[PDB]
A paper describes a structure:
The African swine fever virus (ASFV) type II topoisomerase (Topo II), pP1192R, is the only known Topo II expressed by mammalian viruses and is essential for ASFV replication in the host cytoplasm. In ASFV, a functional viral Topo II pP1192R has been identified, encoded by a viral gene conserved in ASFV strains, P1192R. pP1192R is detectable at an intermediate to late stage of ASFV infection, mainly within the cytoplasmic virus factory, and has been confirmed to be important for ASFV replication. Topo IIAs exhibit a 2-fold symmetry and comprise two functional domains: an ATPase domain and a DNA binding/cleavage domain. The mechanism of enzymatic action involves the opening and closing of three gate-like dimeric interfaces, which are called the N-, DNA- and C-gate, respectively, upon ATP binding and hydrolysis and DNA cleavage that introduces a double-strand break in the DNA (G-segment) trapped in the DNA-gate for transport of another DNA strand (T-segment).
To capture the intact structure of full-length pP1192R, the protein sample was then analyzed by single-particle cryo-EM. After collecting and processing 2134 cryo-EM images, two types of particles, referred to as State 1 and State 2, were identified and reconstructed to the overall resolution of 2.77 and 2.98 Å with 131 161 and 78 195 particles, respectively. The electron density was only observable for the DNA binding/cleavage domain in both states, while the electron density of the N-terminal ATPase domain was absent. Following the process of atomic model building based on the EM density map, the apo structure of the pP1192R DNA binding/cleavage domain was well resolved in both states, with the C-terminus of the protein (C-gate) adopting distinct conformations, accordingly described as ‘open’ (State 1) and ‘closed’ (State 2). These apo structures can be traced for 779 residues, ranging from D416 to H1192, except for the region containing residues G471-N501. The other typical domains of the DNA binding/cleavage core characterized in Topo IIAs, that is, the metal-binding topoisomerase/primase (TOPRIM) domain, the catalytic tyrosine (Y800 in pP1192R)-containing winged helix domain (WHD), the Tower domain, and the coiled-coil helices, are well illustrated in the two pP1192R apo structures. In the closed state, an extra dimeric interface, the C-gate, was formed by the interaction between the coiled-coil helices of two protomers, which retains a distance of ∼16 Å in the open state. No significant conformational changes were observed in the DNA-binding groove when comparing the two apo states, while the coiled-coil helices underwent a distinct conformational rearrangement, presenting the dynamic cycling of the C-gate between open to closed. The coiled-coil regions (from A' α14 to A' α18) of each protomer move towards one another in the closed state, with the furthest end moving a distance of ∼13.4 Å and a reorientation of ∼12° relative to the open state.
Numbering used by the authors:
A (entry chain B), B (entry chain A): 414 to 471, 496 to 1192
Write the structure that this text describes.
Amino acid sequence: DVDKYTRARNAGGKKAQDCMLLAAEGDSALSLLRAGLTLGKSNPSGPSFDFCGMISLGNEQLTNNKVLQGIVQVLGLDFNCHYKTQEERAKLRYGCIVACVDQDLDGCGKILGLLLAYFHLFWPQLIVHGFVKRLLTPLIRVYEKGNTVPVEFYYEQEFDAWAKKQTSLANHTVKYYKGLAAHDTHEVKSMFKHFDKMVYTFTLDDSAKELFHIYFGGESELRKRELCTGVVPLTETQTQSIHSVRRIPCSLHLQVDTKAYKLDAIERQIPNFLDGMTRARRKILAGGLKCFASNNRERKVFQFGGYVADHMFYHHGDMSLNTSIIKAAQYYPGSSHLYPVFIGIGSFGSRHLGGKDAGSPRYISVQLASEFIKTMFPTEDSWLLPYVFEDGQRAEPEYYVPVLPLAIMEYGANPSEGWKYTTWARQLEDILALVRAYVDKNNPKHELLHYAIDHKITVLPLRPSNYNFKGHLKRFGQYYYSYGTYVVSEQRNMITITELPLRVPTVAYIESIKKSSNRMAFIEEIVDYSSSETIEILVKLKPNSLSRIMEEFKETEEQNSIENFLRLRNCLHSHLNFVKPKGGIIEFNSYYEILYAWLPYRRDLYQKRLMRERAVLKLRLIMETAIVRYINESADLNLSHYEDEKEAGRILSEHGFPPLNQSLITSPEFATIEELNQKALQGCYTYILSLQARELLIAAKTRRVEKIKKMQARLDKVEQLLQESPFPGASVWLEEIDAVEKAIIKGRNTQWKFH
Amino acid sequence: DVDKYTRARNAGGKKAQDCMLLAAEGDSALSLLRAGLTLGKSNPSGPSFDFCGMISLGNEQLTNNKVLQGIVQVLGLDFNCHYKTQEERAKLRYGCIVACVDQDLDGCGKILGLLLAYFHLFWPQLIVHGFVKRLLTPLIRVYEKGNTVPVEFYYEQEFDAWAKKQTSLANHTVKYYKGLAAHDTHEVKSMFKHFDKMVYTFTLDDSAKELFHIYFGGESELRKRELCTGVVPLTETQTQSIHSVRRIPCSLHLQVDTKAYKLDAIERQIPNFLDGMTRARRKILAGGLKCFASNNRERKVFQFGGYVADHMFYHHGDMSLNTSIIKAAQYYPGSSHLYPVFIGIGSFGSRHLGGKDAGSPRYISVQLASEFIKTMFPTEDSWLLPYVFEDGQRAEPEYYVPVLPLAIMEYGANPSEGWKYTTWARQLEDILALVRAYVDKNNPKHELLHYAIDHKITVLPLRPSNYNFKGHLKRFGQYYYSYGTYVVSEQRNMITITELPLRVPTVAYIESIKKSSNRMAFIEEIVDYSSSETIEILVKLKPNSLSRIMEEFKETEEQNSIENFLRLRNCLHSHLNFVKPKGGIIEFNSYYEILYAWLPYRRDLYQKRLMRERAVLKLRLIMETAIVRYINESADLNLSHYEDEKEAGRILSEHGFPPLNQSLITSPEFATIEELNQKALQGCYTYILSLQARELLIAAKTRRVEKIKKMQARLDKVEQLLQESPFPGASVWLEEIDAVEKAIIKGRNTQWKFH
């Protein structure tokens, strides 16, 4: 077999039942297992090569794979045995096979799930009676400073419960070990001390079998139904039951690990319907917001990609990161981004190659479209979004909620086969009219739009956008078609294609025309004299070929003879599969329902921002009233730093000064509403104990009083902003819509350069 | 026919001589050319498709090259015919061919030099009289915010000469355009407005055929000899002549750009002999120092690579960066780095796979040593090294000069074949003794070693290091051999290998043994029961077979029969090829030559560092004395901060108060001695006007006088530290050597973990 197999000393012998075969995922896991097994030979008594062999991993096609062939060869497994009896199972060369895989979505999920599916399909009785086992390593380890002994959790839920049970984590360092290679040598020896406690068994409950037909079977219909609901994390009772007897039911593993892996794989191609961007593009947008927040100077594409990888935890390949950055910065007729989030200083590609003619990342530079991004992705709303956490560190948000539905007003296609997704940008005017009717409460269609929302029918048009399109858009039999424009000169027997169909690359169109032999039977030659953004394809035909073209290619009342011959028609087939914000997959059938689903999320975000702003304003005015009421009697109490700052708190508590938490009321970063109003109090008097002498003079007092009157006016303004007729925060939504419309118009005027 | 050829309207007709062909390397340059050529009604009478065609640049092999075949087909060139006469030169379909290429050692030199060599080899008469032309786009553009028209320099020397005057850059922005894709649309149209004057014609002067043969011919000895001197940039006179006549000689073009490209390609594999690291490794070290100069917290490999790319201008791929980071963080018996610059938390590989079994960059984390680096690479000297400026921004230094020569005490190899380079680490004790004898001046061999370095003979041993090696290092006459250790038991017929030769991967060695069919005629089986760091490989042989190995593999007075059978000897072949600090390539016959070459550079760096320290200490001393005198007798003129206008400057210049550059003196980053002393007295009086009230009484005067006393003591310590008998700064070098030896000992004791 392969040389990756390290045989145990007693493997296949009289004591083969006591032997176990560790199946590491890759070379790093193999090296870790080797190091642990060899260090166990000297200090402890336990695992070693005497009773532990090592191997590495690498239906109709699952039987010819070399790795499974090697595994079945070493284990001595017989296909036609079914291992029902104990003596039949005793003939195996190893007592059990232990899978040692990384805790991430690659090791657990895809590979562990694949091994479990293979075993269940071929030898289902092996999973029962406890033959297939796994290695459960500490997923999270928290180290207390000056304690040199960590506390370990095998699941994120246990760590979250312990953390919320804890008072503070100032002196605790949390390390996430998603992969086996992340364990240090001392950590590895700590695991191999009680290696016997890290072996978990699979039970193969009744519900597992059907699941094995869903995630890994050839049935691709019920798989989508299973995937369209998101992954539910394991509950605490299930984890406790698993840890009690060290047995993991297969069902739970299939429903959690493999399902999360499949969802992650889908999310890398299909974007969320709230912002129209995938996880990688969300990371890029967040990194651009973080980098150009205060500087906004042009940076090289590779430099910005390095910044994104450093700060936004983009652990994928840098070539994909650079390609996605270029795609986000591309702006041309037929581009995938109608409103790009980045301004591209340099040659970022043209419509002829479909954006593939972009310059190298080391030459072209990128900048943040500050005006458009700020008007569409407000900085205030960024705090209230739910964020993803990579190894306990903040990263890009789970989803962005722009002022207008970005998943609709921009083009989008998935080139990777496996899941169909195609979106054609709708007209900006129609989107603006629809949202303004929904929010304005003064539009005559506002009540009609609400009627259309509660019961699903269409009341306002939603036509495909034709901003950078010089052709025609014809709706025939519920299908939209884009037609390019051409001219014919009979005297020179020549045709000049002036406009290709929507999102059709020039070189791709030319090669498609050239491939068809029948088309070339009349075309003498083709050249491409098109400009950087316009289309001018010069085709010269053979003599007396126009009549032959007319008689051969026939008009179908939709496209004339020339358009059919020149392939100047495109069908706007759109696949509206999107990723739910909670994790699931949702398949729409029209853009109207996409907009109807996006509206409540934006409305709820506006309401949440309004309540958070109201609470923050109340807290700020409370602390300002406290500081001014200390100021006007500073000649009565006279204690800021005159005495020791430990006896002051008694006298400030004897008077009416509530404890407050500075740096939380002064600048709440991500303080959620209930936590913000809970932990704002029970702080300390640093807002009074640690003030400066600058506040002593009356000018500071009058500045404070004008500030407090300003925030009182703002508080009443946001209070009347609430309980509005359509919903709280509708007027501010209308103002943001107007601002983003102005920004879009300005960008369109200056070719998305903004001077 | 040709895939990416856009024919001109008049090409191949009565105006062929007026038609020119633009050759582009990639699709980005083609898109730029298409955008420039299609300015209709804007930039009139400029280039267009009427007289400009386009083509893309996608010794028997040169004949069948598809790109060159397309080019010759387009131009109608004839291989047999020599275009020496004007009448036969008019048969070409284009008047001239223009190369529109980048200016970053790839567009220029690599493929432009290739095109020039092709034309010279096949049609040398074409280059003369003018046929091959190039597009010299503005390399550097200086924009003034109040002028909105840039100043363009086509060479870096011109920009440097301009920057010699116009010193302030008070309101100027410098932009570097190394590639064609870096130009913006307005820049593109401005360039195409003068496209007629942007073209430069090659001349093929004398002494260029020999240069062409050297750089592109099959001969390599003279090509290597050319590369031992480095690239010399064009002088002002040559650039002025080129710009005045708009003709570029081929020789100058070659020696300027293709030599630089070849040197850059070489130095990406061959490291410098001063620090023992290539450009990528030096960038990694500088980025690590920048990242962990303050925190030293462990970071993921991919995050650190992103930081390095963002800050150190590492524009290459991220996989190479991650691999190099892992290699720099690897520490195991046989690893390349005996003293790694990085502490790696996780599994970074093992000796078995030669470091190729490391975990993914997502999981394993890296951090700076912060204890060995601070001693081997002092932070004081980091301000004195020459620095590499990429696109006008600072980057990793030109070369590092460590306290001990790292190119001689670390294993090095070149995985990229094309330039042999192999280094075997010398013993640390021998190197320390040699350097101490050279420096301490008290060693009995000090003057003897000076005589030795003067007469290039060897007087102190330099033996290969055997720190992490349990074998034997034996010298058999002008070569060294490493022998592994084995134990063989005749009973039960097993041979257990306990130590492999130096830098021999375990799995590679096992595979090499396995491929030898004759050796497995006796080997029953091979098992790899080795540990993580020590090797224990079991080889079970066939019964009564040891005598067969005795009679088959014969003793050669160097290898035992078992050693020859198991290939337990390795020859320590050395290839002492390095790159000169100025750019050239140097070859050494022994490690003694490397040490003797590295010593003067380090001695001169100590002298320069001490000189700069003395100068900056004198500057600080005069500024402190000035401020002390001001705080002493300010009552005479004025004691307040109200004098912040020019009146204070005038009243201070009336007395003996010199104007000093406070910012430069208080923190000179890279100010060398000459302009340090030139700009010291060209500052302002801010060193006095920036005195807070705290510093306006005696309580700060005592601190000031204590500071001046301490720095005066440091000043005369530097003073008599100089003029030492061996060289100035000998004791500082000795104590730095002791500190670095202590750090190395601590790292070796802690397995390069430092707890």
